Short mmCIF file of C-alpha atoms in Angstrom, two decimals:
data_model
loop_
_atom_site.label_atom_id
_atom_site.label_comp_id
_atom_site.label_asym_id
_atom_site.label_seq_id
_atom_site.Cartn_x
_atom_site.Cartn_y
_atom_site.Cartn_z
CA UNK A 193 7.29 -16.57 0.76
CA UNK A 194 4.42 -16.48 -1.89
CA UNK A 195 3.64 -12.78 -1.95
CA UNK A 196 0.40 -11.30 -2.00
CA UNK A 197 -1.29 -7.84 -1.72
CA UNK A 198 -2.18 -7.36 2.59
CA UNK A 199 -0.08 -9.28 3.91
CA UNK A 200 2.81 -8.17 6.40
CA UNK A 201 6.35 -7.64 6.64
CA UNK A 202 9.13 -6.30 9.20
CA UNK A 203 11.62 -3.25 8.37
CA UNK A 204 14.75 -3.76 10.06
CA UNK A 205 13.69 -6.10 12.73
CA UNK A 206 11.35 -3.11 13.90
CA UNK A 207 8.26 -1.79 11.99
CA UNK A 208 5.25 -3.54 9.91
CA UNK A 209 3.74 -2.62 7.15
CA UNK A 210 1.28 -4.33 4.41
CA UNK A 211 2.47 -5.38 0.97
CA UNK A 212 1.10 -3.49 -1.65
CA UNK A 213 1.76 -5.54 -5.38
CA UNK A 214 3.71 -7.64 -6.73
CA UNK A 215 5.66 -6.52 -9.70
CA UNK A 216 8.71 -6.67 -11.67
CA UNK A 217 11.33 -4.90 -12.93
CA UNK A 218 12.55 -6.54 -16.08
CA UNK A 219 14.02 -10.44 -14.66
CA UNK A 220 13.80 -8.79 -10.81
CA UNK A 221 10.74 -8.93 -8.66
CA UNK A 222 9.55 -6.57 -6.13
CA UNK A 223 6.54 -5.54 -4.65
CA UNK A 224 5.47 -1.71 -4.16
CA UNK A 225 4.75 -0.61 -0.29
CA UNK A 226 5.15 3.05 1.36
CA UNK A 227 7.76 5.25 1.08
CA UNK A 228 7.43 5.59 5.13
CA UNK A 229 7.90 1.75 5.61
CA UNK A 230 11.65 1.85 5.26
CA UNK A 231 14.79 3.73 4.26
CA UNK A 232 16.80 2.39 1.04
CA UNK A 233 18.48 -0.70 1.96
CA UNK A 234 16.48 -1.59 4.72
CA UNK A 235 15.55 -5.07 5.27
CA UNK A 236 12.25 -6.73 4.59
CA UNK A 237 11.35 -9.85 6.35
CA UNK A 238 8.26 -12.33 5.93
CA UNK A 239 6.98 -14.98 8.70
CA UNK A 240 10.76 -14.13 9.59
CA UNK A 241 12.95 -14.91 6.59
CA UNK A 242 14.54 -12.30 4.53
CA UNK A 243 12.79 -11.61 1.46
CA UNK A 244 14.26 -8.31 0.03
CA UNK A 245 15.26 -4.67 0.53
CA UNK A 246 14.57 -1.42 0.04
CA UNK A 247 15.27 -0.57 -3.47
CA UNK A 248 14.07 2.93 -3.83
CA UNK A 249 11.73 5.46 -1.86
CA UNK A 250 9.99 8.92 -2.44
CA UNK A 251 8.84 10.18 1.39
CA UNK A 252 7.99 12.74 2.20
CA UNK A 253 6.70 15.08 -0.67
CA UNK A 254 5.26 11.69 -1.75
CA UNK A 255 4.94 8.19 -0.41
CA UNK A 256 6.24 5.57 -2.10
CA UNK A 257 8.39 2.55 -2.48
CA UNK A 258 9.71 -1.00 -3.94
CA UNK A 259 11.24 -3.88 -2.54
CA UNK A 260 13.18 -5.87 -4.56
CA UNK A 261 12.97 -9.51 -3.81
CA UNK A 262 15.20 -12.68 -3.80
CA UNK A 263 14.38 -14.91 -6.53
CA UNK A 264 12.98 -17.74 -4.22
CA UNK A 265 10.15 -15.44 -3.61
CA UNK A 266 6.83 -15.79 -5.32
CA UNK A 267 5.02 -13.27 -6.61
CA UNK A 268 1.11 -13.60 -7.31
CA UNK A 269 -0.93 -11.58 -8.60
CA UNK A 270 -3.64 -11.30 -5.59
CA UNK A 271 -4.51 -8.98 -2.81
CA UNK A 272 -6.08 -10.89 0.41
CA UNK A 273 -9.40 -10.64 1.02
CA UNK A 274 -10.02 -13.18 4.87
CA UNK A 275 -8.97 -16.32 3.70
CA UNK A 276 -9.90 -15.70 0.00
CA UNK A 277 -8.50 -13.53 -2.55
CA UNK A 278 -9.04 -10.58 -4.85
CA UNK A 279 -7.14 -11.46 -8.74
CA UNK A 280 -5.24 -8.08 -9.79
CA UNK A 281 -6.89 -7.55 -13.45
CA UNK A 282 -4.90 -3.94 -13.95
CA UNK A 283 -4.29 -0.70 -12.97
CA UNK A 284 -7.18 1.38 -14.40
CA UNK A 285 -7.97 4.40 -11.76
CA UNK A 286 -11.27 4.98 -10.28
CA UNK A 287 -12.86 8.26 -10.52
CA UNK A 288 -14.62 10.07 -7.10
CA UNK A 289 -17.50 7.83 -6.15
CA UNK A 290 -16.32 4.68 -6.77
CA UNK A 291 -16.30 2.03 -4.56
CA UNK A 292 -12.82 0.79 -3.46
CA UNK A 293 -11.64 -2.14 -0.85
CA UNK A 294 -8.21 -2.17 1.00
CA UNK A 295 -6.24 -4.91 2.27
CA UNK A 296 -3.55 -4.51 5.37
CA UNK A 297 -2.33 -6.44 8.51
CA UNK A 298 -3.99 -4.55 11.28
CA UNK A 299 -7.43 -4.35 10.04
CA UNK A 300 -7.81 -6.71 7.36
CA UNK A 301 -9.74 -6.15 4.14
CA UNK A 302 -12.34 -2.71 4.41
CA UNK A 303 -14.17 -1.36 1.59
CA UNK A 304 -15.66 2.34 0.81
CA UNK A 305 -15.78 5.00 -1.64
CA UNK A 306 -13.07 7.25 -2.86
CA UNK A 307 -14.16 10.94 -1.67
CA UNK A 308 -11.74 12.97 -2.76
CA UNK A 309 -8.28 13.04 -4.95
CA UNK A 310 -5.01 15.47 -4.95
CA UNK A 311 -5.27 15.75 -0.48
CA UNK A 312 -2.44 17.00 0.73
CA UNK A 313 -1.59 15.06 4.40
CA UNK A 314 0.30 17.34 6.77
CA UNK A 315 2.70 14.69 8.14
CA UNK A 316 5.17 15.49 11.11
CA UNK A 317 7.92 14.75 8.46
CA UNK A 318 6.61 16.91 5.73
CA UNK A 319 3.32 17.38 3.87
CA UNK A 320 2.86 14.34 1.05
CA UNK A 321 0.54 15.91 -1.70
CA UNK A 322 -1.38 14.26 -4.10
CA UNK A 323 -2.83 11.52 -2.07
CA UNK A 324 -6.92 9.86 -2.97
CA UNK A 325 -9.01 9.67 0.04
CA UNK A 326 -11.35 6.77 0.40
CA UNK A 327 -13.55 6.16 3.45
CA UNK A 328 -12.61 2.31 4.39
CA UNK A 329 -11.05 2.42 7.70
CA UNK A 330 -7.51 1.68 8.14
CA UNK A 331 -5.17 1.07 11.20
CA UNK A 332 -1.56 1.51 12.19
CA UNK A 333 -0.26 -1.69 10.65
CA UNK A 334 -2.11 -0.87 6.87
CA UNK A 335 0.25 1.65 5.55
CA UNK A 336 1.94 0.20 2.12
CA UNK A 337 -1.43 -2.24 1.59
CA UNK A 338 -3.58 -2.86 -1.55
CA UNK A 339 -6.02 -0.47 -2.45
CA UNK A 340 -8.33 -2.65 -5.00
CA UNK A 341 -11.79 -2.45 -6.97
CA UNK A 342 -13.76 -5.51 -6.25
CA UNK A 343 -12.64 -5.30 -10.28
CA UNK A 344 -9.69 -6.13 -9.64
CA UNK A 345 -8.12 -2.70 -10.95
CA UNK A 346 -5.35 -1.94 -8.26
CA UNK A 347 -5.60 2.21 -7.18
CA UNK A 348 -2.01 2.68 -5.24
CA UNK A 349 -1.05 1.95 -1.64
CA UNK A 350 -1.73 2.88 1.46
CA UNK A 351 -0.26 6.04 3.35
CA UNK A 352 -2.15 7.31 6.46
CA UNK A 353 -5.20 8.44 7.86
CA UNK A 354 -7.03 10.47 10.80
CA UNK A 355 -5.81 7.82 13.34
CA UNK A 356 -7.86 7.60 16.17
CA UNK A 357 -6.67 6.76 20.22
CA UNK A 358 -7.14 3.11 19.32
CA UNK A 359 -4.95 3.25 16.38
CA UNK A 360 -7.45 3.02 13.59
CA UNK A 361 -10.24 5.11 12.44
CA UNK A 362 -12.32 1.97 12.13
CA UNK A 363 -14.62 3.42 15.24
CA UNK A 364 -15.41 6.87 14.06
CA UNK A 365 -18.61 6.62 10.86
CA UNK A 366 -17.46 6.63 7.56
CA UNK A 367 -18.50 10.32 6.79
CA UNK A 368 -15.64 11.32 9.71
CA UNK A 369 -12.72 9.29 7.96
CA UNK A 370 -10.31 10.25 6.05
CA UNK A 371 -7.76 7.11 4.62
CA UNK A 372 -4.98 8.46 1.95
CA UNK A 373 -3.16 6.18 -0.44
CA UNK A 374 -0.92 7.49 -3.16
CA UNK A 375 -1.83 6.46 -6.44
CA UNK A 376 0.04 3.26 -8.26
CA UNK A 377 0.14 4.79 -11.97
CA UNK A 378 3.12 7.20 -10.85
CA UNK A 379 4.93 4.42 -8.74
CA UNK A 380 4.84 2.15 -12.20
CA UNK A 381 6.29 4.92 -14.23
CA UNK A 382 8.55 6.43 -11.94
CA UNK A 383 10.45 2.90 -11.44
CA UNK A 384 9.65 1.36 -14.49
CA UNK A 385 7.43 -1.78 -12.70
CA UNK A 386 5.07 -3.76 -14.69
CA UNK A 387 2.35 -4.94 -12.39
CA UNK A 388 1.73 -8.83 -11.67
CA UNK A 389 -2.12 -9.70 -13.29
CA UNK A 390 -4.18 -12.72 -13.41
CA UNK B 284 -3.25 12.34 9.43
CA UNK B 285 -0.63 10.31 10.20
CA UNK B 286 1.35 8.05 8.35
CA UNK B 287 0.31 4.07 9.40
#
């Protein structure tokens, strides 16, 4: 599978979520997603082929993961954008104010501002701290997807949001959402990733 | 907030 930033994947035969970035780990490659997606060892599956698993996972507390692919994969270093495509340049972080896009399988590629950073999101699992909160809307489906300057400077992944009844938060004005990703600089460290750029 |  050619992997890009958006696009979706299966846990276990059961739950979706959105690719974050592709990355490596010294010879393997991977691609960060959310901590909630899967358990270590879970499978990851693309268009129905088995791609990777699990390789590591902070969640609760924080939200985070890797997959670590098969070598037949390809990585690239692009987030989807429609039928076009944003080029990862880096991973400098935006300050408040800034205007920021995500990219996700439920609904597609949004863009907004960050509002605020450090939110703590009381989660029926356990509160995740730390999280940015932009104001593109996001649906169930997102969670693990590419949060992106139009720059091309990658911000972290996708976590959760003030989900409305019909899943997303998409129908409620921006000033009423609230969208949380945790931030990619401490996924990179934490599991020693260098990020795929173009 | 939920998680997604």
């Amino acid at each position: 599978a050619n992997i890009v930033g958006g696009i979706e994947y299966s846990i276990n035969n059961a739950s979706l979520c959105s690719v974050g970035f592709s990355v490596t780990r010294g010879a393997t490659k991977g691609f960060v997603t959310a901590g909630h997606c899967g358990t270590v060892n879970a499978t990851a599956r693309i268009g129905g082929a088995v791609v990777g698993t699990f390789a590591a996972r902070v969640f609760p507390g924080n939200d985070r993961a890797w997959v670590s692919l098969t070598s037949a994969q390809t990585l690239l270093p692009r987030v989807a954008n429609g039928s076009s495509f944003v080029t990862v340049r880096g991973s400098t972080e935006a300050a408040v104010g800034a205007a920021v896009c995500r990219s996700g399988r439920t609904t597609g590629y949004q863009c907004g501002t960050i509002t605020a950073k450090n939110v703590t999101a009381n989660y029926a699992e356990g509160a995740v701290r730390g999280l940015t909160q932009g104001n593109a809307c996001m649906g169930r489906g997102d969670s693990g997807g590419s949060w992106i300057t139009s720059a091309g400077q990658a911000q972290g992944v996708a976590s959760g949001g003030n989900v409305q009844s019909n899943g997303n938060n998409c129908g409620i004005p921006a000033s009423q959402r609230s969208s949380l990703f945790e931030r990619l600089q401490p996924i990179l460290s934490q599991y020693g990733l260098s990020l795929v750029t173009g | 907030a939920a998680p997604l």
